[PDB]
Design an enzyme around this catalytic site. Structure first.
Site, PDB file in Angstrom:
ATOM      1  N   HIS A  19       0.072 -16.323  16.328  1.00  0.00           N
ATOM      2  CA  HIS A  19      -0.578 -15.295  17.135  1.00  0.00           C
ATOM      3  C   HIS A  19      -0.073 -15.262  18.590  1.00  0.00           C
ATOM      4  O   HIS A  19      -0.138 -14.222  19.253  1.00  0.00           O
ATOM      5  CB  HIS A  19      -2.103 -15.433  17.051  1.00  0.00           C
ATOM      6  CG  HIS A  19      -2.653 -15.179  15.677  1.00  0.00           C
ATOM      7  ND1 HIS A  19      -3.743 -15.858  15.169  1.00  0.00           N
ATOM      8  CD2 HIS A  19      -2.264 -14.314  14.704  1.00  0.00           C
ATOM      9  CE1 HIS A  19      -3.992 -15.434  13.942  1.00  0.00           C
ATOM     10  NE2 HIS A  19      -3.115 -14.490  13.637  1.00  0.00           N
ATOM     11  N   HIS A  42       0.214  -8.889   4.891  1.00  0.00           N
ATOM     12  CA  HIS A  42      -0.804  -9.757   4.310  1.00  0.00           C
ATOM     13  C   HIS A  42      -1.858  -9.954   5.401  1.00  0.00           C
ATOM     14  O   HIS A  42      -1.798 -10.910   6.175  1.00  0.00           O
ATOM     15  CB  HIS A  42      -0.180 -11.093   3.898  1.00  0.00           C
ATOM     16  CG  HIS A  42       0.857 -10.973   2.820  1.00  0.00           C
ATOM     17  ND1 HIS A  42       2.038 -10.278   2.995  1.00  0.00           N
ATOM     18  CD2 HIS A  42       0.901 -11.478   1.564  1.00  0.00           C
ATOM     19  CE1 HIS A  42       2.752 -10.348   1.885  1.00  0.00           C
ATOM     20  NE2 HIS A  42       2.084 -11.066   1.001  1.00  0.00           N
ATOM     21  N   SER A 100      -4.710 -11.708  12.754  1.00  0.00           N
ATOM     22  CA  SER A 100      -3.664 -10.829  13.269  1.00  0.00           C
ATOM     23  C   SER A 100      -4.103  -9.364  13.408  1.00  0.00           C
ATOM     24  O   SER A 100      -3.723  -8.695  14.368  1.00  0.00           O
ATOM     25  CB  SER A 100      -2.411 -10.926  12.396  1.00  0.00           C
ATOM     26  OG  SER A 100      -1.965 -12.267  12.288  1.00  0.00           O
ATOM     27  N   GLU A 118      -4.325  -5.775   2.268  1.00  0.00           N
ATOM     28  CA  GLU A 118      -4.966  -7.010   1.809  1.00  0.00           C
ATOM     29  C   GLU A 118      -5.475  -6.783   0.378  1.00  0.00           C
ATOM     30  O   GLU A 118      -6.143  -5.774   0.112  1.00  0.00           O
ATOM     31  CB  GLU A 118      -6.133  -7.391   2.719  1.00  0.00           C
ATOM     32  CG  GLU A 118      -6.989  -8.551   2.197  1.00  0.00           C
ATOM     33  CD  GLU A 118      -6.184  -9.827   1.918  1.00  0.00           C
ATOM     34  OE1 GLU A 118      -5.495 -10.317   2.832  1.00  0.00           O
ATOM     35  OE2 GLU A 118      -6.208 -10.327   0.774  1.00  0.00           O
ATOM     36  N   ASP A 143      -0.324  -4.169  -2.515  1.00  0.00           N
ATOM     37  CA  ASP A 143       0.635  -5.236  -2.328  1.00  0.00           C
ATOM     38  C   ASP A 143       1.386  -5.045  -1.020  1.00  0.00           C
ATOM     39  O   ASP A 143       1.980  -3.995  -0.792  1.00  0.00           O
ATOM     40  CB  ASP A 143       1.619  -5.257  -3.489  1.00  0.00           C
ATOM     41  CG  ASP A 143       2.734  -6.259  -3.281  1.00  0.00           C
ATOM     42  OD1 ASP A 143       2.522  -7.461  -3.508  1.00  0.00           O
ATOM     43  OD2 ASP A 143       3.835  -5.838  -2.889  1.00  0.00           O
ATOM     44  N   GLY A 144       1.379  -6.085  -0.186  1.00  0.00           N
ATOM     45  CA  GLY A 144       1.972  -6.036   1.132  1.00  0.00           C
ATOM     46  C   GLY A 144       3.479  -5.865   1.103  1.00  0.00           C
ATOM     47  O   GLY A 144       4.023  -5.138   1.908  1.00  0.00           O
ATOM     48  N   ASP A 164       3.168 -12.273   6.663  1.00  0.00           N
ATOM     49  CA  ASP A 164       2.447 -13.540   6.789  1.00  0.00           C
ATOM     50  C   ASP A 164       1.790 -13.952   5.471  1.00  0.00           C
ATOM     51  O   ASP A 164       0.567 -13.999   5.380  1.00  0.00           O
ATOM     52  CB  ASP A 164       1.375 -13.397   7.886  1.00  0.00           C
ATOM     53  CG  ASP A 164       0.631 -14.695   8.172  1.00  0.00           C
ATOM     54  OD1 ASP A 164       1.158 -15.756   7.833  1.00  0.00           O
ATOM     55  OD2 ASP A 164      -0.495 -14.650   8.722  1.00  0.00           O
TER      56      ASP A 164
END
Ligand SMILES: C[S@@+](CC[C@H](N)C(=O)[O-])C[C@H]1O[C@@H](n2cnc3c(N)ncnc32)[C@H](O)[C@@H]1O
Length: 280
Positions: A19, A42, A100, A118, A143-144, A164
């Site tokens: 971060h 994510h 995030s 997510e 799906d990211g 991430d």
């Protein structure tokens, strides 16, 4: 399948590094008036309860964010990030940690955009409620890695892509590399920030190999280890791999890493480095 829960780890040394880098990159992007996209593949729940049973089981936040957020000699590079943390803990006790998406939500401007994904059925509804009436944000249960194809390039033609994953499935180690190559193909001037854990140094070496092989240039590596490498100590380190890092990022990290490491790891074990995987 999606058994990972980030609440155990929220605010640990790895989140602090991740971060810190996210915030510095965002602040750099805001140096131009034109809008940019924040893409979080994510994204997680949005914020995390530190008093939760899951946080206190590990209590990893005690050795992460807790060791820096009230330091009076906080490096100027950490102010933006820490001021987000303070915003969510206005009582002065550490009870909540912003993920995030919430660091982005408070650092981005009116004209900027967020695209968040997510998949987890507890965390998705939570994330969605964090962004009600924030029309800058688009939040999806998808799906990211697929977003790196579907959402790039952004209409704004500027942005930070945070990748991430939890690395619960070993396939993430390949998926991050193929995902980045797909993203880059579509948006070669994007800033890509990939977080990784060091559990087995082996897998990181291989991942970095595969990254080098994409032929992508201008790749910075920032790593903070709280312990030396091992094959029986869980996660001993984590890092951020940044493609197209902003002009000041290397220097900012050189400015802040010794302090960060000193605070996160009082015993002095492990290391903290910034270097180039692939120069320009
Ligand atoms: C550790 S978290 C990331 C937290 C967040 N980026 C932050 O900094 O606060 C990883 C998350 O990805 C979710 N996830 C796992 N696989 C995914 C996928 N293929 N697409 C989207 N989300 C995924 C998990 O449910 C978990 O919330």
């Amino acid at each position: 399948m999606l058994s990972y829960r980030h609440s155990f780890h929220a605010g640990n040394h790895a989140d602090v590094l991740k971060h810190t880098v996210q915030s510095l990159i965002i602040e750099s992007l805001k140096e131009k008036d034109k809008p940019f996209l924040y893409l979080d593949t994510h994204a997680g729940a949005g914020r995390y309860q530190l008093g939760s049973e899951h946080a206190e089981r590990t209590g990893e936040y005690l050795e992460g964010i807790a060791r820096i957020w009230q330091q009076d000699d906080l490096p100027a590079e950490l102010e933006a990030y820490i001021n987000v943390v303070k915003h969510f803990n206005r009582s002065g006790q550490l009870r909540y940690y912003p993920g995030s998406p919430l660091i982005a939500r408070l650092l981005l401007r009116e004209q900027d955009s967020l695209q968040l994904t997510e998949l987890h059925p507890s965390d998705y509804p939570l994330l969605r409620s964090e962004f009600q009436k924030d029309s800058r944000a688009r939040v999806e249960k998808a799906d990211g890695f697929q977003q790196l194809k579907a959402k790039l390039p952004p209409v704004s033609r500027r942005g930070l892509i945070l990748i991430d994953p939890p690395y619960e499935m070993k396939t993430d180690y390949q998926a991050v590399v193929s995902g980045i190559a797909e993203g880059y193909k579509r948006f070669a001037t994007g800033i890509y920030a990939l977080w990784y854990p060091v559990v087995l140094r082996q897998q990181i070496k291989r991942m970095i190999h595969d990254l080098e092989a994409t032929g992508i240039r201008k790749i910075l590596q920032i790593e903070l280890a709280v312990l030396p490498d091992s094959d029986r100590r869980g996660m001993t380190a984590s890092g951020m791999i940044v493609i197209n890092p902003p002009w000041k990022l290397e220097q900012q990290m050189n400015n802040v890493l010794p302090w960060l490491h000193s605070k996160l790891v009082p015993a002095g074990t492990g290391h903290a480095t910034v270097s180039w995987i692939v120069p320009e």
